[PDB]
């Protein structure tokens, strides 16, 4: 009758949530403050991550060059991603300077990227972005952050590099995709079932729509909340209703998405 | 057919960060999401962001219109404001162009006329030689300062009310544990329906916090719907539930 939970796993859950909602500045703050990182990377993969998140593109290029002559290592796409992020950062520095030499740096990055581009049309789009007073005036690059772009670059680079890590017993757990939202909705469903069972026993039998519209995510009616009543109730109960076929209704969620400040 | 707002989830995360005193992350999330856990007037929010962003003279100018009131302690407010200012000045001076010791001494003798007792100020004077109470985090200190000034300025700054927008306390933890218990209940119902022996300790040990990737659906709710109403009042032991929480390995760097 005892359960063990780790706060580091809860912080991994909220880190996965922040990443799923593109709150990458909050994610990096939470990582550097609590020390935890969602996942288990190599001792050198952490170095590569710190390089990518700090904008050390030349160091990233000299770091993976030992892996140049390989087999499935797509050096074309790797260098394309790195130099494209470098060029976009130089362009964001240039268009905000309005100059000096940032235009020279942007054009040098564009010439370095001139070869690794997958198509000439994408290179034309890049050289067209070079002219705009703000690269965010393009529909594709409209919502573009340096931090989110660096996180995406690292996510694309590790999937190609991984090239090892140390195996552990249970230190290699990540947080499954949308695990915190799933656990929150499952806890809300547990509250709904407990309310449906406490009301059905207490006389008034409402339709299942009542207990679903009575969902309160912010305030919880249960002060202690966990009474461990549903499990012990299922414990001593006839085993015939477990083989009772039921309806397969679908759970319809409508998420009021976040209005992030620009 | 339910309504879920990501703002409420972010309020739960904010409450969780405040419970563990991860205030740098809490402030970063507030700034990046535009979400604030709790009800505040348009003036209380302004005082809040002034205190959090480190604008002390602006706070003093903002609350000066309330110091003339009778039922107000204008001695402790300026005391704590100038104390936090002096501590932040001392901290920014302790960093390895220097003219900050002048500002440190000015902030010290700016609060000399506001300390409750003289021995407290005398001890404060000894801090210029160093770290004798180093749980002092600026973000945490600014949050504590905002709380200590809000528990006294709200009498004149009404809340314009109810507390229906606050993320409760530890509600994220409760909902996570309840989701784990829902997974335990569904694994029990699957076990005793497929011809498998099962007990209560094994389903409790079978808790996968980080993820048993049983997908989300209302199957248990429909099973409760299509189930007779004559067995919903049985006799079962109210067990002794305990949750041991392995606390955080908060590192030492700032």
């Amino acid at each position: 009758e005892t359960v063990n939970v780790k706060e580091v796993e809860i912080i991994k859950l909220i880190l996965d949530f922040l990443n799923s909602k593109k709150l990458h500045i909050s994610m990096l703050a939470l990582e550097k403050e609590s020390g935890v990182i969602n996942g288990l990377f190599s001792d050198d993969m952490l170095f590569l991550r710190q390089l990518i998140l700090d904008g050390q593109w030349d160091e990233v290029l000299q770091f993976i060059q030992p892996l140049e002559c390989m087999e499935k290592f797509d050096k074309k796409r790797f260098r394309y991603i790195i130099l494209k992020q470098k060029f976009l950062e130089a362009l964001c520095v240039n268009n905000a300077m309005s100059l000096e030499f940032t235009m020279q740096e942007a054009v040098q990055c564009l010439h370095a990227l001139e070869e690794y581009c997958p198509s000439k049309d994408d290179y034309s789009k890049l050289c067209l972005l070079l002219t705009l007073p703000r690269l965010t005036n393009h529909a594709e690059f409209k919502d573009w952050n340096p931090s989110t772009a660096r996180v995406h670059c690292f996510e694309e680079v590790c999937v190609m590099v991984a090239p090892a890590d140390r195996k552990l017993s249970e230190a290699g757990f990540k947080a499954s995709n949308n695990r915190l939202f799933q656990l929150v909705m499952k806890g809300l469903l547990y509250e709904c079932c407990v309310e449906f069972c406490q009301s059905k026993a207490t006389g008034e039998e409402i339709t299942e729509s009542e207990v679903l519209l009575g969902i309160d995510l912010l305030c919880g009616n249960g002060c202690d909340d966990l009474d461990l009543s549903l499990l012990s109730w299922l414990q001593n109960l006839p085993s015939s209703v477990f083989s009772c076929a039921f309806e397969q209704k679908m759970l319809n969620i409508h998420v009021d998405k976040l209005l992030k400040p620009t | 057919t339910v309504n879920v707002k990501e703002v409420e989830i972010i309020k739960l995360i904010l409450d969780f960060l405040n419970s563990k005193k991860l205030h740098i992350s809490m402030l970063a999330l507030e700034k990046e999401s535009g979400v604030i856990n709790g009800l505040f007037s348009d003036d209380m929010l302004f005082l809040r962001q002034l205190i959090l962003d480190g604008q002390w003279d602006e706070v003093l100018q903002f609350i000066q219109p309330l110091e003339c009131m009778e039922k107000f302690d204008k001695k402790r407010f300026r005391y704590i404001i100038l104390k936090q200012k002096f501590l932040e000045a001392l901290c920014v001076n302790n960093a390895m162009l220097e003219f900050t010791m002048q500002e440190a001494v000015q902030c010290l003798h700016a609060l000399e006329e506001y300390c409750p007792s003289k021995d407290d100020y005398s001890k404060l004077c000894l801090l210029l030689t160093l770290a004798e109470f180093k749980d002092w985090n600026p973000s945490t200190a600014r949050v504590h300062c905002f709380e200590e000034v809000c528990v006294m300025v709200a009498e004149f700054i009404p809340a314009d009310r109810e507390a229906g927008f606050k993320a409760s306390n530890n509600r994220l933890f409760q909902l996570v544990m309840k989701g784990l218990l829902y997974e335990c209940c569904v694994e029990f119902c699957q076990s005793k329906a497929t011809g498998e022996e099962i007990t209560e300790s094994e389903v409790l040990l079978g808790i996968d916090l980080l993820c048993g990737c049983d997908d989300l659906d209302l199957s248990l709710l429909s099973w409760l719907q299509n189930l007779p109403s004559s067995v919903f009042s049985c006799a079962f032991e109210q067990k002794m539930l305990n949750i041991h929480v392995d606390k955080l390995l908060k590192p030492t760097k700032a």
Partner: peptide, 16 residues
């Protein structure tokens, strides 16, 4: 549409 706990259990164990 109808579904049972045993059906879901078998769907899950026959999908690893």
């Amino acid at each position: 549409k109808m579904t049972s706990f045993a059906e879901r259990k078998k769907q899950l164990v026959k999908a690893e």
